[PDB]
């Protein structure tokens, strides 16, 4: 249970830092929409979960690099959170 909690903290850090750095990378590119923090946080979530609706995405090189970090660290850490929840659920199947 302690390790699931650490993975959740890492995920939140990735989502927040990804949101901050995406705005920083995308402002200055005409036509970019990933330029205010609340919706950049929505974007980082849609990326770390791999859902990727595509209502928002980065258009600059450094925004796309930020995206890659959010993918690498965020999909790993969301996978860890997901794995922990599936293990806990499989437990109470056994407990019935």
């Amino acid at each position, epitope marked *: 249970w302690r390790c699931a909690g650490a993975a959740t903290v890492l995920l939140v850090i990735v989502l927040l830092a990804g949101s*901050y750095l995406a705005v*920083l990378a995308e402002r200055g590119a*005409p036509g970019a929409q990933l330029i205010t*923090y609340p919706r950049a946080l929505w974007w980082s979530v849609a990326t770390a979960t791999t859902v990727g609706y595509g209502d928002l995405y980065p258009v600059t090189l450094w925004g796309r690099c930020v995206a890659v970090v959010v993918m690498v660290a965020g999909i790993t850490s969301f996978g860890l959170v997901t794995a922990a929840l599936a293990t806990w659920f499989v437990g109470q199947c056994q407990q019935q």
Partner: antibody
Amino acid sequence: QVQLQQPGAELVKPGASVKLSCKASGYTFTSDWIHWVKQRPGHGLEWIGEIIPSYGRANYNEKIQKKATLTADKSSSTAFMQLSSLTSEDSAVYYCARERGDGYFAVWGAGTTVTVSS
Amino acid sequence: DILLTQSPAILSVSPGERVSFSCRASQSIGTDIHWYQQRTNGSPRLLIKYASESISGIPSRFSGSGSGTDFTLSINSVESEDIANYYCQQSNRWPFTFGSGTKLEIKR
């Protein structure tokens, strides 16, 4: 209390430069952006540029000539705009404005009246 | 860059009647439009954010509507203090841009 403090006026000779200041108070966050807006007498609002003081990155309106350079000083919570090589076309009121990274200008300075004249 | 058309540039109105300011964007910007009032010799003042959301301190007579490309700032029952220039501003795409402004005039 007044949240953004700007000098009232600056007189600059044609071809010279000037540094405008915007002193921020109230709540400050890392998501804050300081913006600069130019208004010539009898005209509308014209976006000049923005800087994020927590990082120091600045961006500029690409549709007009680049006459401005934006900096910030986190210790004195003051943003600066360097206007250089000025002309009569640069005579205007220059506002600074604070945006919390969510797209709108919640608070504005009183503006600095810049006149370019000999 | 998003062009914001405010037409008409001057709005002439009798006291106490309803008035509507129009702002039209050159492409769809969802609800990312904000409205400012600027009185003679004053600084701009935020009236409405995100097309319809009210601001603390702004009289309830002010409201906004619209989404996509067509946006309206409305004043129910104008009074003399509403005489000013009114600007819209979008935050949907970089860079932020301003409309050219509408002046409110009152027929007393």
